[PDB]
Amino acid sequence: ITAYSQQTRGLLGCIITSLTGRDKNQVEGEVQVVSTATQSFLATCVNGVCWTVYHGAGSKTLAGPKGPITQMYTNVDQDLVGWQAPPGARSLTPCTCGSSDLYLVTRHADVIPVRRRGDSRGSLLSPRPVSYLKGSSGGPLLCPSGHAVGIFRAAVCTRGVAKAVDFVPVESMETTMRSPVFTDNSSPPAVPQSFQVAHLHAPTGSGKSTKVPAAYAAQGYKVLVLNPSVAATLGFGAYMSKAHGIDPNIRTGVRTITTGAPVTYSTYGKFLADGGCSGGAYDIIICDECHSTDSTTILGIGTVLDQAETAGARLVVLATATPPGSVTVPHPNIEEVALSNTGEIPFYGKAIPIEAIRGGRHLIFCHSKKKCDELAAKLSGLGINAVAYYRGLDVSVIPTIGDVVVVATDALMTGYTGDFDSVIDCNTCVTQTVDFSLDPTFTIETTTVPQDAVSRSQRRGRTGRGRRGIYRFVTPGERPSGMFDSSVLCECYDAGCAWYELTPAETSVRLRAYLNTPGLPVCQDHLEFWESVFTGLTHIDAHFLSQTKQAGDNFPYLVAYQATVCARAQAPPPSWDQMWKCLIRLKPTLHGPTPLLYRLGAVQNEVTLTHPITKYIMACMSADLEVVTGSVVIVGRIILSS
Amino acid sequence: ITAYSQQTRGLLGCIITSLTGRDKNQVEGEVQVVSTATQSFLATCVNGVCWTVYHGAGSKTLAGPKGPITQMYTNVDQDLVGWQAPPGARSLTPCTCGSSDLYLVTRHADVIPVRRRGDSRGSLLSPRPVSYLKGSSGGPLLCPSGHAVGIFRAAVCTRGVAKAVDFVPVESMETTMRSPVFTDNSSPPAVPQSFQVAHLHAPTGSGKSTKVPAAYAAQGYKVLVLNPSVAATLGFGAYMSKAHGIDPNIRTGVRTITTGAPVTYSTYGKFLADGGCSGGAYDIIICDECHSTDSTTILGIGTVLDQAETAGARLVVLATATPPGSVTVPHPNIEEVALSNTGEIPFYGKAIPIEAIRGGRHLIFCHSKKKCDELAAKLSGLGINAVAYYRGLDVSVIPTIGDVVVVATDALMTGYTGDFDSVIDCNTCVTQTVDFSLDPTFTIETTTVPQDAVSRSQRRGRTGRGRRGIYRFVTPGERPSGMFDSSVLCECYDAGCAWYELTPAETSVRLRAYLNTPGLPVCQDHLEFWESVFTGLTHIDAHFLSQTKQAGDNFPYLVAYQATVCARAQAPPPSWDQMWKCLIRLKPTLHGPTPLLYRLGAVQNEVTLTHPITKYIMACMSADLEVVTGSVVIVGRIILSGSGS
Ligand SMILES: [NH3+]Cc1ccc(Oc2ccccc2)cc1
Numbered sequence A: 001i002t003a004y005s006q007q008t009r010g011l012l013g014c015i016i017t018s019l020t021g022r023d024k025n026q027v028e029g030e031v032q033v034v035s036t037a038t039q040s041f042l043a044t045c046v047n048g049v050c051w052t053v054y055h056g057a058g059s060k061t062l063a064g065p066k067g068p069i070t071q072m073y074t075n076v077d078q079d080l081v082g083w084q085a086p087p088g089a090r091s092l093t094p095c096t097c098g099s100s101d102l103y104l105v106t107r108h109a110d111v112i113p114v115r116r117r118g119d120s121r122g123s124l125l126s127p128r129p130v131s132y133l134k135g136s137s138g139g140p141l142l143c144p145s146g147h148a149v150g151i152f153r154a155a156v157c158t159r160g161v162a163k164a165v166d167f168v169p170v171e172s173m174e175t176t177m178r179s180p181v182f183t184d185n186s187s188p189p190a191v192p193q194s195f196q197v198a199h200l201h202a203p204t205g206s207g208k209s210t211k212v213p214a215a216y217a218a219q220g221y222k223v224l225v226l227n228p229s230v231a232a233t234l235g236f237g238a239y240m241s242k243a244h245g246i247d248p249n250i251r252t253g254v255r256t257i258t259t260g261a262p263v264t265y266s267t268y269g270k271f272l273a274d275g276g277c278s279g280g281a282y283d284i285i286i287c288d289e290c291h292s293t294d295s296t297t298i299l300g301i302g303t304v305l306d307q308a309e310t311a312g313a314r315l316v317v318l319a320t321a322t323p324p325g326s327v328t329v330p331h332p333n334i335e336e337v338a339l340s341n342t343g344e345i346p347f348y349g350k351a352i353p354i355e356a357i358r359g360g361r362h363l364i365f366c367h368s369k370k371k372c373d374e375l376a377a378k379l380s381g382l383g384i385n386a387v388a389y390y391r392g393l394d395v396s397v398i399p400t401i402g403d404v405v406v407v408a409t410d411a412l413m414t415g416y417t418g419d420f421d422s423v424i425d426c427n428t429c430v431t432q433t434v435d436f437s438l439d440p441t442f443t444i445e446t447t448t449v450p451q452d453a454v455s456r457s458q459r460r461g462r463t464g465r466g467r468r469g470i471y472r473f474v475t476p477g478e479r480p481s482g483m484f485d486s487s488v489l490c491e492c493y494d495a496g497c498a499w500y501e502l503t504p505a506e507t508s509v510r511l512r513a514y515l516n517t518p519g520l521p522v523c524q525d526h527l528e529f530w531e532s533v534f535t536g537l538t539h540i541d542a543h544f545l546s547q548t549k550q551a552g553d554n555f556p557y558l559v560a561y562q563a564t565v566c567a568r569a570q571a572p573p574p575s576w577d578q579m580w581k582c583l584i585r586l587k588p589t590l591h592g593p594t595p596l597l598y599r600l601g602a603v604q605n606e607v608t609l610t611h612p613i614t615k616y617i618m619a620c621m622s623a624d625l626e627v628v629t630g631s632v633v634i635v636g637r638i639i640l641s642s
Numbered sequence B: 001i002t003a004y005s006q007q008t009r010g011l012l013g014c015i016i017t018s019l020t021g022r023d024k025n026q027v028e029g030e031v032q033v034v035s036t037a038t039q040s041f042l043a044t045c046v047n048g049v050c051w052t053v054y055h056g057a058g059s060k061t062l063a064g065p066k067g068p069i070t071q072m073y074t075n076v077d078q079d080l081v082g083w084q085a086p087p088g089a090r091s092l093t094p095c096t097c098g099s100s101d102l103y104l105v106t107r108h109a110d111v112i113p114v115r116r117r118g119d120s121r122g123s124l125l126s127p128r129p130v131s132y133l134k135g136s137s138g139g140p141l142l143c144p145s146g147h148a149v150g151i152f153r154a155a156v157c158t159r160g161v162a163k164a165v166d167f168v169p170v171e172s173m174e175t176t177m178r179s180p181v182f183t184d185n186s187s188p189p190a191v192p193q194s195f196q197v198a199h200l201h202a203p204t205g206s207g208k209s210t211k212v213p214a215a216y217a218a219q220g221y222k223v224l225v226l227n228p229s230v231a232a233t234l235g236f237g238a239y240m241s242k243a244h245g246i247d248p249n250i251r252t253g254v255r256t257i258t259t260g261a262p263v264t265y266s267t268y269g270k271f272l273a274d275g276g277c278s279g280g281a282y283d284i285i286i287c288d289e290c291h292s293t294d295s296t297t298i299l300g301i302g303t304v305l306d307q308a309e310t311a312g313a314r315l316v317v318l319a320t321a322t323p324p325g326s327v328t329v330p331h332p333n334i335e336e337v338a339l340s341n342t343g344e345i346p347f348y349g350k351a352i353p354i355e356a357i358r359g360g361r362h363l364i365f366c367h368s369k370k371k372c373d374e375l376a377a378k379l380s381g382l383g384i385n386a387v388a389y390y391r392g393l394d395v396s397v398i399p400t401i402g403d404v405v406v407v408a409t410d411a412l413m414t415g416y417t418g419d420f421d422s423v424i425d426c427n428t429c430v431t432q433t434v435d436f437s438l439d440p441t442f443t444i445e446t447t448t449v450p451q452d453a454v455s456r457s458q459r460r461g462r463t464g465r466g467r468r469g470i471y472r473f474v475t476p477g478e479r480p481s482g483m484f485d486s487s488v489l490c491e492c493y494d495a496g497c498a499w500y501e502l503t504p505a506e507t508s509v510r511l512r513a514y515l516n517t518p519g520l521p522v523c524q525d526h527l528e529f530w531e532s533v534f535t536g537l538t539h540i541d542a543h544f545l546s547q548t549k550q551a552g553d554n555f556p557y558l559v560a561y562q563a564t565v566c567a568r569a570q571a572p573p574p575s576w577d578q579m580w581k582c583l584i585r586l587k588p589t590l591h592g593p594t595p596l597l598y599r600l601g602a603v604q605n606e607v608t609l610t611h612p613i614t615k616y617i618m619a620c621m622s623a624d625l626e627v628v629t630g631s632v633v634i635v636g637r638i639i640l641s642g643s644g645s
């Protein structure tokens, strides 16, 4: 095998084409170089279908001769997407009698030897920088005969040096093609003779966590319905007593009720607080909002999947309006309008007319609490009745009746259950992103990022509920949905220690149940990495753990454990911002360099690396780490020949 | 003082506008959010001129009502460029009485208080990560009265936190405006009565390395001519003695010759090897190729500027075809032709058709030695006589001579002096950047990047000499010339130690003479930081040093030092790349994590940061590092409050 690249489009055409969705150039070759507005990567044609990775492609359409091609196949559990191949596309053909010597075509037309180990794993003969492979997701792994063993999806790395490759085997495509491209998941499953995890995809309003649990209980089953939101968990209790004459049990941290009833409503949080499943309690477990990628939902859903075959249950139901890989589609009840630039109120580069929000009840989403208070002032300045809500504030700041503009962060989603005449969306959210920076260990950065399609649908779906709604937006983009960052896993272990007395090895078992169930959000497999680092975080100071839970910002356990080590060395904290207020009382006492374990923010101090734990963590970094490496547009192609 | 922002264009409207260079949208506001294809930053309109930083904007035009607006001012030393505001556009105005309370406006429309601490420095009352200030270059510092104090150009960092901001004081802008738009520099200067550093910007052709040094000799003056290339130096000498009559002294490593003549030709390397200026020696020194930013040319010119006046010289001419700021205009003699896809030979995305090169003499440039070899092999299949040249190989591996298609890296432009019928350029080169990654110390990465204007001009310069010439290219456009990376300073200290027995403190002085002389290539000033690093690198192993020196590769002193520490820890090197070949010999006896000092490449062994040297370098990192933080298109604006705070 031999290979060379050919650039077919430059920037302007790629943009123009992305928007029009009309690729008029004739698709020659069988490996294409593709681009989105942000990423560039490779797509291979096998068996008449043009394949690539989900983390690159998303749910995006392919620009084609007659306009946008929607995806024919979308397996988010195998990081696989595929479009029907435009007429005149050559295709590689599968590999019958696999060799072990493979050849990985990169986007620079370099052909890289690979030794096959697993079904989906290959080891690079000559290890290379991970940077080298980035751009080559969805490039084909070949055998010498030129046939197609699979498509590349991740590097497996030691300390930033790719030594193995992760690929999608060609049979997983053959499975994928064979799978029902449309499956029906709107009606609730019947209660099978033995254990079975089932899915329920139904829009909000289908009674997923009211009608259906009522159905199961009328059939005589004892039913637990798990939910992220306390406001929601509590709200069902009341709706039930009314519209189905069951006073159900309610279990929330704040306030629980045990009527004896066959149906229980519970927060995932409280579920975990009570040691998961009690054997004999329930026949059916409904996990609502399982598209949720907060640590408590993940850990909770993990637990249910881990425990319920044993606790006697016969049916787990993963219920959601927006499963991984789903596209934000028109709602028949919600007019969607773009914010423009002629309005009285600046809002994320655009403007809001004061007409649009004077009188009525409106919801303006912002990414940050700073920007909320800023906007809630501006509006009160203009005589509009504005109110900020975010993590911290109590939900009574939101008047339940009467005109108001609520400027909120996403906290609003789990904190408040009402709906609104309009919603204005800045179309962006803050997120936490772990970086294996080796300076000395890992870092957790905050970042404003484009909203994913799940968020857009949660946000927009706060208007239009059985009554008409306007949804105003700054921008039409979604990022693709149902993927989460490794830092979410990190948060689970932190949570496991902080709140639910779980040893890191028990958290792992539950996360591993989550990861190995198809149809959930996906995540690079870093369970062992994180387990190992938390394994080493021993003899924490209870009193510091206390104050970081109390204050309730993220990573209370890591923040406490740094805090701890800092105190066992009269050594000051990384910095004197809020995070390390739990030390203010010792400020004039501490002096020297900070014994740094990891970066959870700006470090403003001398730092020594010579602490035994820091070293343990650095040794944890030598772990194998799987890393990843408008329409999608074809910008170029790689031509194959040994 | 408060602010908010308006996005006035999308991503497509912005590409269309960069290419056409025509923007109709009224220019409202004072602070403009401008953008290139590659990046984005701020531009502030002051006294009717629309200013921004050179590092963002280069020499690019600015889209406007009737078409691209040409830069009125360009000061690559201040990092400052300016276009005439289209009539309409509001302007800020300067401060009328230095109040020290200041206010920086960021591209996120945040306004962040700054305490003025000198002519063009202010400290953040609240330190913040540098990443927060990125894309705010060209933004204004305002006094409390809302007047322009300066345009922000860089953050001063400790370990990635901005504690202070550097700006272009609006008085510098005042000078610039009250001054000529066009300057001469085209003609050789007359010799002054006392010391003076003149510039000379003239085409290769103006004989600035032969004609003008003759002229000065004809007037009875001793002139020394420094050049980076050793081929260029011997060739100028030869030409002189012959077509000019004076047998000139040559001073190069490969060939030294003392006639006694009044003209001496030399490379920068030999000059530096000879200890620089020997008192009395010369009156005029011509630094040809001052635009070069090889460590040797930078150290050499630094020495000349540091020593030339005390050595009794009267005139240093900094000589160059392409000074910082210069743009690639066309040629009378060179038709330039977009390479394209339809062609028998693949070449960086496009193809080269054979007919184009089947007969005659051709230079094909390639970003790397690998691609040269690979492309040689391919051209000797289709049966064209094609050599590959590059660093390592010998100059005479090229026919002088027959039919040929030479496939070269930039090494060509110092080794060889001949020209060609057509030149094919992939338009990209290989740089080194230093990243202060604190992992544990710093990284020197070798990257591939778009070529700058000088590069394009040199590469295209190898045709169209006194005849027709075709220029084929993979990509139009250049990045801006006259800026070099912090790694190049690193190379300078490294050569200082490796080659020229200069201690770091001595080197600082030479380089500081370079930096503070204006009209040369500019540079993030990291002198004290590197000086510190190399001061701590003591008791290097002479034998490793001599092997890395011989080897020809980069950072010989750093590679050999890293090797020294390893050998003496009986630890293996960070990899078994070619870079570490000097330790292969010893491979059996080397066990354990490597005691890592810095990163020059892929670390593969386990590492360990307990070495005293690691810690020393780690401490050096707490230094104060200044970090930078088609037409330019206005894509938005920041609006400032007219009253109140
Ligand atoms: N950036 C987060 C991210 C990126 C890629 C990704 O792909 C996967 C991972 C695991 C299984 C299947 C697909 C998951 C999460």
Ligand SMILES: [NH3+]Cc1ccc(Oc2ccccc2)cc1
Pocket (backbone or CB within 6 Å): B054, B055, B076, B077, B078, B079, B483, B484, B485, B486, B522, B523, B524, B525, B628
């Ligand atoms: N005030 C001197 C000055 C002028 C320009 C300059 O631009 C650069 C240089 C190097 C890298 C990035 C930008 C740096 C320093």
